[PDB]
Design a protein around this ligand. Structure first.
Ligand SMILES: Nc1nc2c([nH]c(=O)n2[C@H]2C[C@H](O)[C@@H](COP(=O)(O)OP(=O)(O)OP(=O)(O)O)O2)c(=O)[nH]1
Ligand SMILES: Nc1nc2c([nH]c(=O)n2[C@H]2C[C@H](O)[C@@H](COP(=O)(O)O)O2)c(=O)[nH]1
Ligand SMILES: [Mg+2]
Length: 291
C-alpha cells in the first residue's frame, strides 16, 4: 500500500538562492516541506497546499525533482518533489513546524538530515530553477471516434472528461498558468474552458496543432510550439494524442532533456520548464483522476 505525498524545495532570491528547511518537534527533524495528498488531490496541488500550510508561503511550482520512497506502518511513503519559487508569506512557529530557516544550498545540504532530501536538493541544484513553463495538455475523455474519416471535429468531452477539465484548473494554476491555447477541435477547447473562466482569459485557437495538420505539416507545428513558448507568460496548450508525443520527443532530443516519466493519457499534462529559452525539464503528469 502506498501513502502518496508531495512537497518541494521552496526557494527565494537571497545556486545563490536560499531554500527553506523546516523543523518538526514531533520527530525533532529537519527536512523539506511536504504532505499527504487529500482526497481527489493531484501531487502538484498537494505540494502547493502543504508548502503553504507548513511554511506560510504561497509559491509557483516549476521543475519536478524526482521521487522518494520509504517504509512506514501503513506500507510505503511516496513523495514527489518540485522546485517552488516563493511568492510571499510569513512563517509562524507552531506545534507542527516550529522553525523554518532560509539557507543557501550548500548550508541546506548540511542542515537536511535525510539522505533522500539531500538527493532531492542535489537535483535542484543540477539545473536552473528560475524557470518559465509551458503546459502541454492532452484533452480529456471524449468518447470513442466515429466510423467516419477524420477525427470528429465537434465531438465533445464526456462526463468524465468534463470532470477532468474542472480538476485541471487547480493542477495548471499550481504552475502559474497565464495564457491559453487549444488545437482547433471542440474537445481541446472544452478541456481548458474551466481554466479560461478562472483566469477570465480567452483561448487562442491553433489550427496548426490538430492531428490532421501535424500529419500534413509537422514542421509548421514545431515552429508554432516554439513561437507560443517564446511569448511572455506561462502558456497552456491543449492538443491531441498523435501530436503530443512527437512534439515532446522532438523537444527533449534537441535539448538533451530526459523525461523521468512518460505517458500520453487523455487529461495528462507535460510540464516543460524553460530557462533563457532552453528546455531544462519535461515532466509528465498523470490525468487528475488517475493515481
Ligand atoms: N520528512 C521525511 N521524513 C522521513 C524521511 N525518511 C524517513 O524515514 N522519515 C521518517 C520520519 C518520521 O519518523 C516518519 C514519518 O514522517 P512523515 O514525514 O513521513 O509522515 P507524517 O505523516 O508525520 O508527515 P507528512 O507525510 O504528513 O508530512 O518517517 C524523509 O525523507 N523525509
Ligand atoms: N535537531 C536534530 N538534528 C539532527 C538529528 N539528526 C541529525 O543528523 N541532525 C543534524 C541536524 C542538526 O544541525 C544537528 C542536530 O544538533 P542540534 O540539535 O544541536 O542542532 O544534526 C535529530 O534527530 N535532530
Ligand atoms: Mg508534512
Amino acid at each position: 500500500h502506498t501513502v502518496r505525498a508531495a512537497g518541494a524545495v521552496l526557494w527565494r532570491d537571497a545556486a545563490t538562492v536560499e531554500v527553506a528547511v523546516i523543523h518538526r518537534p514531533r520527530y525533532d527533524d529537519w527536512s523539506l516541506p511536504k504532505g499527504k495528498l487529500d482526497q481527489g488531490e493531484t501531487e502538484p496541488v498537494a505540494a502547493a497546499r502543504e508548502i503553504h500550510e507548513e511554511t506560510g508561503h504561497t509559491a509557483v511550482l516549476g521543475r519536478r525533482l524526482g521521487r522518494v520512497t520509504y517504509p512506514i506502518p501503513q506500507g510505503t511513503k511516496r513523495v514527489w518533489y518540485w522546485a517552488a519559487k516563493s511568492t510571499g508569506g510569513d512563517f509562524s512557529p507552531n506545534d507542527e513546524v516550529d522553525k523554518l530557516v532560509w539557507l543557501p544550498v550548500d548550508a541546506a545540504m548540511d542542515q537536511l538530515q535525510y539522505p533522500d532530501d539531500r538527493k532531492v536538493l542535489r537535483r535542484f541544484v543540477k539545473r536552473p530553477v528560475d524557470t518559465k513553463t509551458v503546459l502541454v495538455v492532452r484533452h480529456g475523455t471524449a468518447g470513442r471516434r466515429s466510423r467516419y474519416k477524420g477525427d470528429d471535429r465537434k465531438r465533445p468531452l464526456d462526463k468524465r472528461g468534463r470532470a477532468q477539465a474542472e480538476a485541471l484548473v487547480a493542477q495548471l494554476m499550481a504552475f502559474g498558468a497565464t495564457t491559453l491555447y487549444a488545437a482547433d477541435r471542440v474537445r481541446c477547447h472544452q478541456t481548458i474552458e474551466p481554466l479560461a473562466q478562472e483566469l477570465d482569459q480567452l483561448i487562442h485557437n491553433e489550427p496548426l496543432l490538430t492531428e490532421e495538420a501535424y500529419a500534413a505539416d509537422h514542421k509548421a507545428a514545431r515552429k508554432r510550439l516554439l513561437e507560443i513558448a517564446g511569448r511572455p507568460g506561462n502558456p497552456v496548450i491543449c492538443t491531441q494524442g498523435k501530436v503530443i508525443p512527437g512534439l515532446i520527443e522532438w523537444w527533449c532530443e534537441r535539448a538533451k532533456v530526459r523525461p523521468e516519466t512518460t505517458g500520453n493519457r487523455k487529461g495528462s499534462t507535460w510540464v516543460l520548464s524553460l530557462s533563457d529559452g532552453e528546455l531544462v525539464g519535461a515532466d509528465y503528469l498523470s490525468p487528475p483522476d488517475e493515481k
